[PDB]
Structure formats: structure tokens, C-alpha cells
């Protein structure tokens, strides 16, 4: 009977309990082969040779055109619009009237009155809601991420999207281009040659080496991919599969999975009435050890997950007054947590114990998340909750399990905290969750992007 999120919550009991017991299953990175060689060698190659990341399938694309497109973005983003011209992209971050992050994605300024958003569903949904109901003179084409389990059905996108990354990425890029390619400033857009095509580019990079994101119409996907793989053999470039790909951010530092902070607040009710009952927001899941009965305790604001530097009070935008009220120097801070190797060994050892009543929560490799939104409690030595761990996995490059977290600002790097791993009472009813007992895992606060920190 419910058709929108507001009706789902009215009928669904406590919002946290619903989300933490959702039947949605895993958050899937679709369609791309799980592995091409193996996830360990694929992780190694983005730090030691070169890789082709296939980003064609796991993100929502919004094609936004019209007289009011730039206004729609300016009205809804914390980012400065001042001086923004075609061929520059931004990491679009919208907040609610209450100052909390809704989501984020990349907004490409393609030409006059032509933009494309690329990212998870929540910030796309917010843009569509405002384009539809806010009176904007704008046309939107929504191209959903691909189906999680296509089961043999054909898959289409409007565009393909790849990245070429790694210490030898620029060598591959210039080999493809046919000569020297200028390294522009980060997120500036241009073009390059690939097999006689003019391919638009976005200056990117990771682990201290420049790279590119590239895209084009879906029909040229194979033509481009085969040229990249062929030219890159000289430099050891290998394609990366969907098993290894999402673990890259454990090293790069981007938290992809903030809870869309839209479940409460009278000013957000019209949005809850617009969001479908089968939306990401209504159907998705929360996993991990952090327990509150108030869904607001799962919200983050931009300063807490690293977007403080993007906030610019130089344009009107939703949530501006709330952000101006915040003191940036007392906000929780994004860190990397380096999980203790002995504790990791203990977690895995418990899978092979034939006599114990229970084992510790299965920690998949290289990505251990088991919901759309991840929320593990971070504790100090006295047992206080001092942060929230939001994305969890393992780097073959570091031989460490790692998570991205937001913790109280005064905690110095090198501090050993604990992350409570697993859920309470044998686990929630999520279909990703097998019965298990919890473990406090020792974790050292480290910088973001990750760098090795003595304890």
C-alpha cells in the first residue's frame, strides 16, 4: 500500500530498527566481472603499475540541461559556484536544511546549460526532487545504475565511464593519445585521443600519481576498452574487477556511504512524500555495531567526513544557516583506522573452530561491508563512543584491514581505539548477516588518505 517514504515510515515502526533489519541484501557493484586476474594482484597494480577501473555500472547518472541547471546546483550545493565554467567538475555535496549530508557525487560542467551528475542514488534523488517541484526551468534524464543481479538480461547505459590510474597511468594515457598530454589541475576537463576518437577527460589521480577519468557514448565502450588494454600491456596495465574496485577508497579516503539524512525534520517531509517506497532511502539497509533508537544519531555533517573545505558561504544554498552555526574546529574528523592484525587473525580463526558456540562476524575480502550504510561504533579505552566507522575492508598493498571513520576531533593520530565489529544479540535480520558474536577490534588512528602510523 505505501507509495512513498513517508508512508513507509508511518507504517514501519522505529526507523532505525527498519533500516537495520532491511531485507534488501548486499550493496552490489554490478555487471563488471568480480575478478579479471585476482583481487590481490588487481589491488597491487593500482599502486605498482596501471589499472583500468570500469565505472560504467555502479553509479546513477543525471543529465541536467536548461536555463536553470546551474541555479539548481548552486541552490542545493555547499560548494562555491563562483567562477564555475564548462570543463571543470566539482564534488557536489548537498546538505539538508538541518546541515546534514544527503549524499555526494561528481558534477561535470560539460557546456553552457549542460551538466551531468554521477554518484550514488541519494544526491541524484535530491536533485530530481528540486528540479521537479522547485520551479526550475530544467530538463533531467535519469540513467539508473545497472541492475544488481542482471541474471543474463542485457544491460544498457547512456555513457561508459573508465579511469586509468596507477604510477604508470600517464605513460599509458600518452601512448593512447599519440603524444604528450598536459596534466591539468585536479578535476579540470579536456580531451584525448583513443583509437581515433575524441574522448573527454577529467584530471584525476591516486597514491601520488596523476590519472584520468574518461567517458563516452555507450556504443564506443568496447572500442575504447580494447585500445586501453592493448596500449597498456607495455606498462603492465590490468583491468580491475568489481570485487577489488570498491576497496580502493580505503586507501584513497573517500567515504561513499553517508546515511541520507532525510528521515526526520518537518522541512524534509515534502521530500519524504516524494521519495518512492522502493527508493534507496526507503528500501536500503544500515549495518554494524552502532545502536541508537534515534535515526539522527546516524547523520553526518560535511565537516565530519572531510567536506569542510568545500563549504563556501558565497551563495544561497539549502542548509547554509545551519552550517554557519557550526564551529568547524569542534567537529568530528575523518580518519583512517588501522585494524590490528592479531585481532584480524582471531576473527578469521573463529570460522574454523568446530566446537565454539559462535564465531566472529564474517569479514569479507577485500570489502567487508554488509549494507548500503555502514555504522560501527568506535570506542575509547573507557568504553565511550567516540566515533563512527563507515567503510571497512582490506588492502593487499598494506597487508592491513582498514576502515574510514569519523571521530572526536581531539583524538591524536597514533591513538589506539577499538571498533566494535559485529552486531548485537546474534545479529540483525539482514540477509547479509550470519549468526555471530561481537569483537572489539583494536584500531590505530591514522591519517586520511591512509599512511602507516606507529602506535
Q: Residues interacting with a copy of itself, by CB under 8 A? A: 25-26, 28, 31-38, 40-41, 44, 56-57, 146, 148-156, 341-342, 344-345, 348-349, 351-354, 359, 362, 365, 370, 394, 396, 398-401, 431-434
Residue whose CB is less far from a copy of itself, 34 or 86: 34
- 3-state DSSP assignment of residue 336: strand
Q: Is 55 annotated among the ligand-binding residues?
A: yes
Q: Is 165 annotated among the ligand-binding residues?
A: no
Question: Shortest gap between Cβ of 79 and a copy of itself (angstroms)?
Answer: 33
**Structure-block grid coordinates of residue 50:** 596501471
Q: Is 257 annotated among the ligand-binding residues?
A: no
Rounded-to-integer distance, Cα 317 and Cα 142, Å: 23
Q: Is 423 annotated among the ligand-binding residues?
A: no
251's torsion region: left (phi>0), alpha (psi -120 to 50) or beta? Answer: alpha
Q: Which residues contact 219 (CB under 8 A, 6 or more apart)?
A: none
Give the H/E segment covering residue 407. strand 400-407
Question: Shortest gap between Cβ of 38 and a copy of itself (angstroms)?
Answer: 5
449's torsion region: left (phi>0), alpha (psi -120 to 50) or beta? Answer: beta
Name the CA dihedral angle for 178, 182, 185, 190, rounded to a multiple of 10 degrees: -50
Question: Shortest gap between Cβ of 37 and a copy of itself (angstroms)?
Answer: 4
Question: Shortest gap between Cβ of 84 and a copy of itself (angstroms)?
Answer: 34
Closest by CA position to 400, among listed 357, 448, 341, 346: 341
Question: Shortest gap between Cβ of 363 and a copy of itself (angstroms)?
Answer: 10
What are φ and ψ of residue 74, in 5° steps?
Answer: -55, -50
What string of DSSP letters covers 92-150? E--B-TTS-B---EEEEEEETTEEEEEE-HHHHHHHHHHHHHS----EEEEEPPPPS--
Residue whose CB is less far from a copy of itself, 36 or 108: 36
Distances (CA, A) of 311 to 68, 83, 307, 374: 22, 15, 7, 25
Question: Shortest gap between Cβ of 32 and a copy of itself (angstroms)?
Answer: 7
Residue whose CB is less far from a copy of itself, 175 or 400: 400
Q: Is 254 annotated among the ligand-binding residues?
A: yes
Q: Is 243 annotated among the ligand-binding residues?
A: no
Residue whose CB is less far from a copy of itself, 109 or 396: 396
Q: Is 246 annotated among the ligand-binding residues?
A: yes
Q: Is 274 annotated among the ligand-binding residues?
A: no
Other CB atoms within a 10 A radius of the CB of residue 324 amount to 10
Q: Is 91 annotated among the ligand-binding residues?
A: yes
**Structure-block grid coordinates of residue 427:** 545479529
Residue whose CB is less far from a copy of itself, 184 or 365: 365
Q: Where do runs of H (alpha helix) occur along 257-394?
A: 269-274, 280-283, 320-325, 341-349
Residue whose CB is less far from a copy of itself, 150 or 447: 150
Residue whose CB is less far from a copy of itself, 356 or 413: 356
Question: Shortest gap between Cβ of 357 and a copy of itself (angstroms)?
Answer: 11
Name the binding residues for (6S)-5,6,7,8-tetrahydrofolate.
55, 91, 118, 163, 213, 254
Name the binding residues.
29, 55, 58, 91, 118, 120, 163, 213, 245-248, 254
Name the binding residues for substrate.
29, 58, 120, 245-248
Amino acid at each position: 500500500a505505501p507509495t512513498n517514504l513517508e508512508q513507509v515510515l508511518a507504517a514501519g515502526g522505529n526507523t532505525v530498527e527498519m533500516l537495520r533489519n532491511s531485507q534488501i541484501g548486499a550493496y552490489v557493484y554490478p555487471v563488471v566481472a568480480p575478478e579479471f586476474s585476482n583481487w590481490r594482484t588487481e589491488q597491487w597494480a593500482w599502486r605498482n603499475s596501471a589499472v583500468l577501473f570500469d565505472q560504467t555500472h555502479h553509479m546513477v547518472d543525471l543529465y541536467i540541461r536548461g536555463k536553470d541547471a546551474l541555479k539548481l546546483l548552486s541552490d542545493t550545493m555547499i560548494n562555491s559556484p563562483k567562477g564555475w565554467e564548462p570543463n571543470k567538475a566539482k564534488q557536489y555535496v548537498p546538505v539538508t536544511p538541518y546541515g546534514h549530508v544527503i549524499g555526494d557525487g561528481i558534477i561535470f560542467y560539460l557546456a553552457e546549460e549542460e551538466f551531468v551528475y554521477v554518484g550514488r542514488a541519494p544526491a541524484a534523488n535530491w536533485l530530481m526532487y528540486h528540479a521537479q517541484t522547485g520551479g526550475y526551468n530544467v530538463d533531467i534524464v535519469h540513467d539508473d545504475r545497472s541492475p544488481s543481479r542482471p541474471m543474463g538480461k542485457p544491460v544498457q547505459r547512456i555513457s561508459w565511464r573508465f579511469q586509468i590510474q596507477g604510477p604508470k597511468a600517464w605513460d599509458v594515457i600518452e601512448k593512447l593519445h599519440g603524444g604528450t598530454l598536459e596534466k591539468l589541475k585536479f578535476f579540470n576537463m579536456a580531451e584525448m585521443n583513443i583509437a581515433g576518437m575524441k574522448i573527454r577527460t577529467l584530471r584525476h589521480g591516486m597514491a601520488g600519481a596523476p590519472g584520468l577519468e574518461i567517458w563516452g557514448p555507450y556504443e564506443t565502450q568496447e572500442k575504447a576498452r580494447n585500445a586501453i588494454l592493448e596500449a597498456g600491456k607495455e606498462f603492465g596495465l590490468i583491468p580491475v574487477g568489481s570485487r577489488a574496485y570498491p576497496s580502493n577508497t580505503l586507501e584513497s579516503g573517500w567515504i561513499p556511504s553517508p546515511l541520507p539524512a532525510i528521515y526526520t525534520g518537518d522541512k524534509l517531509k515534502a521530500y519524504r512524500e516524494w521519495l518512492p517506497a522502493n527508493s534507496y532511502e526507503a528500501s536500503g539497509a544500515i549495518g554494524g555495531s552502532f545502536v541508537s533508537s534515534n535515526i539522527e544519531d546516524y547523520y553526518v555533517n560535511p565537516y565530519e567526513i572531510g567536506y569542510g573545505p568545500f563549504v563556501k558561504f558565497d551563495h544561497d544554498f539549502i542548509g547554509r544557516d545551519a552550517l554557519e552555526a557550526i564551529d568547524p574546529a569542534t567537529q568530528r574528523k575523518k580518519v583512517t583506522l588501522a585494524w590490528n592484525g592479531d585481532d584480524m587473525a582471531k576473527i578469521y580463526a573463529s570460522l574454523f573452530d568446530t566446537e565454539a558456540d559462535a564465531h566472529y562476524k564474517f569479514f569479507d575480502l577485500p570489502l567487508a561491508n554488509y549494507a548500503n550504510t555502514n555504522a560501527d561504533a568506535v570506542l575509547d579505552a573507557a568504553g565511550n563512543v567516540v566515533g563512527m566507522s563507515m567503510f571497512t575492508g582490506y588492502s593487499y598493498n598494506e597487508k592491513r584491514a582498514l576502515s574510514l571513520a569519523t571521530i572526536d576531533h581531539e583524538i591524536p593520530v597514533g591513538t589506539e581505539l577499538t571498533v566494535l565489529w559485529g552486531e548485537e544479540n546474534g545479529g540483525t535480520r539482514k540477509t547479509t548477516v550470519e549468526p555471530h558474536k561481537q569483537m572489539a577490534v583494536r584500531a590505530v588512528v591514522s591519517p586520511v588518505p591512509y599512511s602507516v602510523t606507529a602506535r
